[PDB]
Design a binder for these strands. Structure first.
Ligand SMILES: Nc1ccn([C@H]2C[C@H](O)[C@@H](COP(=O)(O)OP(=O)(O)OP(=O)(O)O)O2)c(=O)n1
Ligand SMILES: [Mg+2]
Ligand SMILES: [Mg+2]
Ligand SMILES: [Mg+2]
Length: 377
DNA sequence: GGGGTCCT
DNA sequence: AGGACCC
């Protein structure tokens, strides 16, 4: 059966939140700073040369009058992240999150109802909100076109609600699966929406240049295909299956080629509460158990705060180390789930993990350490 | 780089 | 426990 999915994408997320936080930035070109970088920035400041994920030095050299705020505390950001998700769940319960500023909702059932309450008379009255991709002419006699136009209206409603109620602007993409919804949502930015009719499905996939532009084909898989002389969507569309299956495995091969055609049958998953929490830290060198201890203490500190709130409790903790990652994990003892000291017993366990994984007696060098709580009940 | 999902 | 993807 034919679905109707909507993808929602918040214009420069962290950027938006900062302004909404300190109005005294609305007028001013702005970049959120993570360490030495500018990971996002408002559109006002995009005009002056700035680009996502750019070096802060080059930044000001590109825009002397560039404000800077710190988005190394992702705390303000995820409150909004979930306010957005909750706002949308009120529409349809099934809402899939992707990162902090992206949402998928399945509108198929909500659309059928709107129509199953639409007098056969006013059927021609149905119209579109936002852009129709490739300016493709509407065909109202084609039920599929009808179910998608409604789709656009709900999206327009959702985008207005986000704005009126949360003050956030965003883009929307309405198509027949998550893949196309995602791709069509960025055709018109910022703060605008685009819908995709099926007859223009092939135009959209071919508009893509590098093969790694399709959601799902990431770093590894690209280099795999780039090696095979596969660079375009048509290259991939036309490549031999069997050779791909041999080279990528039947699981991947089958899926990612379907993707080259714009076929995606994966469902909108309900995300609900966060399955896990974590804090990260990378760096040039770390050759001591003791300073590992210091880091491991900090991270532990930061986590205990969210892990605190939430509600439900974590029943497993893990340790991750980059020297290519590797991890260890074990249940947290029953008496530990109890909040009045909790630190020292934790670092004790963590160190135990950090020692069976590493040979301390000998020299060692990590560029990254993480701590993760999960298995929440 | 710095969170989080899922497949296996 | 590790590997891939997403942002
Ligand atoms: N590898 C990455 C990718 C992005 N981000 C951060 C910066 C963004 O604020 C947020 C989501 O990235 P997006 O691709 O969604 O960018 P925006 O929605 O912020 O920008 P745009 O206005 O161009 O859509 O996550 C990050 O830290 N690490
Ligand atoms: Mg995005
Ligand atoms: Mg966006
Ligand atoms: Mg990709």
């Amino acid at each position: 059966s034919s679905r109707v999915i909507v993808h929602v994408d918040l214009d420069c997320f962290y950027a938006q939140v900062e302004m909404i936080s300190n109005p005294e930035l609305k007028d001013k070109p702005l970049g959120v700073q993570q360490k030495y970088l500018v990971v996002t920035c408002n559109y006002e400041a995009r005009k002056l040369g700035v680009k996502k994920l750019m070096n802060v030095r080059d930044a000001k050299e590109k825009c002397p009058q560039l404000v800077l705020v710190n988005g190394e505390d992702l705390t303000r950001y995820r409150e909004m992240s979930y306010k957005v998700t909750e706002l949308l769940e009120e529409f349809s319960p099934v809402v899939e999150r992707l990162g902090f500023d992206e949402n998928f909702v399945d509108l198929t059932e909500m659309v059928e109802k709107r129509l199953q309450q639409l007098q056969s008379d006013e059927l021609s009255a149905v119209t579109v909100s936002g852009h129709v991709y490739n300016n493709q002419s509407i065909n109202l006699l084609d039920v599929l076109h009808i179910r998608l136009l409604v789709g656009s209206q709900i999206a327009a409603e959702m985008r207005e609600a986000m704005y009126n109620q949360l003050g956030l602007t965003g883009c929307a993409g309405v198509a027949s699966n998550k893949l196309l919804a995602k791709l069509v949502s960025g055709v018109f930015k910022p703060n605008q929406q685009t819908v995709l009719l099926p007859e223009s499905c092939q135009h959209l996939i071919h508009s893509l240049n590098h093969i790694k532009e399709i959601p799902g084909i990431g770093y590894k898989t690209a280099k795999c295909l780039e090696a095979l002389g596969i660079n375009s969507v048509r290259d991939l569309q036309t490549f031999s299956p069997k050779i791909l299956e041999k080279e990528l495995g039947i699981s991947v091969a089958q899926r990612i080629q379907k993707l080259s055609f714009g076929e995606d049958n994966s469902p909108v998953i309900l995300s609900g509460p966060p399955q896990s929490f974590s804090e990260e830290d990378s760096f040039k060198k770390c050759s001591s158990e003791v300073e590992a201890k210091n880091k491991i203490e900090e991270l532990l500190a930061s986590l205990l705060n969210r892990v605190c709130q939430d509600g439900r409790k974590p029943h497993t903790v893990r340790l991750i180390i980059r020297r290519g990652r590797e991890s260890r994990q074990c249940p947290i003892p029953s008496h530990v789930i109890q909040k009045y000291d909790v630190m020292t017993p934790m670092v004790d366990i963590l160190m135990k993990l950090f020692r069976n994984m590493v040979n301390v007696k000998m020299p060692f060098h990590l560029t990254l350490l993480s701590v993760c709580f999960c298995n929440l009940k």
